[PDB]
Structure 1
Amino acid sequence: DLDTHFTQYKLARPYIADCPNCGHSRCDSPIAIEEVRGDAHAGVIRIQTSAMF
């Protein structure tokens, strides 16, 4: 579908926040990780980042 993608893109936009990537000591990135989820038996995980894909 494309319509649902439009409703996703109708008003959403990326944003910038902080992540504790300690390779660079609390950097602020567009790719800010938020609440990764994994409970599937097969070992799959989905992650909800801070950038539009």
Structure 2
Amino acid sequence: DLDTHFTQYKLARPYIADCPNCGHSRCDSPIAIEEVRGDAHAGVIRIQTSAMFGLKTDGVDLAYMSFMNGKTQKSIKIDNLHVR
């Protein structure tokens, strides 16, 4: 877990979003899924959350998770994420 192309990371902030479906009565999640790239013929998926995990605003690690709570970040660990 390390961050090198600050093209995406530094020049970004997590952007709050609303999940498209999350039951009948939706949960608002700033990790709302656009641009699924699961069209690999393998079984592996790249997902785009609307959240900018990666850095907090620091210099290192994709090991954090900066999603939006408010207009402000919430820079915590990425290990609570579970793609499945």
Unaligned runs of 5+ in 1: none
TM-score (norm 2): 0.46
Deviation at 1:32, TM superposition (A): 0.8
Task: Return the index of the structure with the highest Cα Rg.
Answer: 1
Which residue does 1:36 correspond to in 2?
36
What are the Cα deviations for residues 9-43 of structure 1, in whole angstroms up to 9, with x where unaligned? 22211011111343371232211111212222212
Q: Are the structure 2 counterparts of residues 36 and 25 from structure 1 closer, same or farther at C-alpha, using a change threshold of 3 Å?
A: same
Structure 2 unmatched runs, 5+: 53-84
RMSD, matched Cα: 2.6
Which deviates more, 3-12 or 29-38? 3-12
Q: Which runs of 4+ in 1 moved over 6 A?
A: none
TM-score by length of 1: 0.63
Who is 1:47 aligned against? 47
Change (3 A) 1:3 1:17: closer
Q: Identity over the aligned pairs, expressed in percent?
A: 100
Relative to 1, partners in 2 of residues 1:32 and 1:3: Cα closer, same or farther, differing over 3 Å?
closer
1:14 corresponds in structure 2 to 14
CA distance in 2, matches of 1:27, 1:41: 31
In the alignment, the residues of structure 2 paired with residue 43 and residue 5 of structure 1 have an alpha-carbon distance, to the nearest angstrom, of 26
